[PDB]
Ligand binder design. Structure first.
Ligand SMILES: O=C(Nc1ccc2n[nH]c(-c3ccncc3)c2c1)[C@@H]1CCN(CC(=O)N2CCN(c3ccc(-c4ncccn4)cc3)CC2)C1
Length: 330
């Protein structure tokens, strides 16, 4: 809060030199880099200026605050006691930066455009007065959608669904959280050598077999939480586009959320987390393809249990209810 800092504050030379672009959205850009031998993901969002960026207006600082707040609150659950989870992406730091875009990041941007292609404008039009928010996250891996063909088996699917359900339950209990946009691009996966992952829900600790993967939830655009009756949420009550998509169950979920909440987005309706978990379970059964099919009895029972989850879970009121009551987790 000593005013904006230069890019070099967050990205000193060596850290800048090691940046590779890994993601993007209308919001801006995501780079992976290394510092102290450890990968991090850097999300860079232009704020406060008059230029369209990627077709949209820039957010003001007041408008970017919700993202910052929610990202921090969910990250801090990894250090709490009664409601503890590491299943949200870890937030290392947030800065407000001022300057034109670093040439080294443009070099990385270009490399990505040449190899993967981009929907974004080349971010080379910013002036030396431009402000940005730079969010530094732990590196969370690769999204479930990109891993459509890369997972081992439905046992891995069960671990992912259990991890997601537990994380959402913990956040429900602590923060009256709803993610509200948990499509399969927002579930990150990375290898872990831990066999069991740990969480605590309202003071009761348990474990989840990892199947070698750690899940991290990202992207709080539409998310809602509260502390001491102060609610932070994205008011989409007047959005048209959001409720008119087609071609994927994802777009039904927006409509189903609006039905559940009567188009009142400030309220708490943890059923929305159940809807997203159902959409994810649907992806696991219908769009994911696994290296090893369920060819044995124990594996076959896992398949049947995930199908039973799919068919029953919409009769639960929250992620907390699913976690605590559903047979899949017993
Ligand atoms: O954007 C992506 N990943 C994201 C996003 C946000 C993130 N926030 N935080 C993280 C994060 C990651 C790891 N650890 C911690 C945090 C994010 C990762 C994925 C990877 C890339 N992706 C799709 C993509 O970038 N495409 C590029 C190519 N493409 C495409 C190509 C050309 C055109 C085009 N349009 C107009 C003119 C010319 N070409 C449009 C789209 C569609 C797919 C989804």
């Amino acid at each position: 809060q000593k005013g904006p800092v230069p890019f070099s504050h967050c990205l000193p030379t060596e850290k800048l030199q090691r940046c590779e672009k890994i993601g993007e959205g209308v919001f801006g850009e995501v780079f992976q880099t290394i510092a102290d031998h450890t990968p991090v993901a850097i999300k860079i969002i232009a704020i406060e200026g008059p230029d369209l960026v990627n077709g949209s207006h820039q957010k003001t600082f007041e408008e970017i605050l919700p993202e910052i707040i929610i990202s921090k609150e969910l990250s801090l659950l990894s250090g709490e006691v009664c409601n503890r989870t590491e299943g949200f992406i870890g937030l290392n730091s947030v800065h407000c930066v001022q300057g034109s875009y670093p040439p080294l990041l443009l070099k990385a941007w270009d490399h990505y455009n040449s190899t993967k292609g981009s929907a974004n404008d080349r971010p080379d039009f910013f002036k030396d007065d431009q402000l940005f928010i730079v969010l530094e996250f732990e590196f969370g891996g690769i999204d479930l959608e990109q891993m459509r063909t890369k997972l081992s088996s439905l046992a891995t699917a069960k671990s992912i669904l259990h991890q997601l359900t537990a994380s959402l339950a913990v956040a429900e209990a602590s923060l009256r959280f709803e993610h509200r946009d948990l499509h399969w691009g927002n579930v990150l996966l990375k290898k872990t050598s831990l066999k069991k992952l740990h969480y605590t829900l309202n003071g009761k600790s348990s474990t989840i077999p990892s199947c070698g993967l750690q899940v991290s939830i990202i992207d709080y655009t539409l998310s809602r939480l509260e502390r001491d009756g102060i609610v932070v949420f994205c008011d989409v009550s007047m959005d048209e586009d959001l409720f008119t998509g087609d071609g994927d169950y994802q777009f039904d979920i927006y409509r189903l959320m609006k039905k559940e909440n009567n188009n009142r987005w400030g309220e708490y309706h943890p059923y929305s987390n159940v809807l997203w978990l159902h959409y994810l379970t649907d992806k696991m059964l219908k769009q994911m393809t696994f290296k090893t099919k369920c060819n044995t009895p124990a594996m076959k029972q896992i398949k049947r249990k995930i199908q039973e989850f799919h068919r029953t879970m919409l009769n639960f009121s929250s992620a907390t209810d699913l976690l605590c009551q559903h047979s899949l987790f017993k």
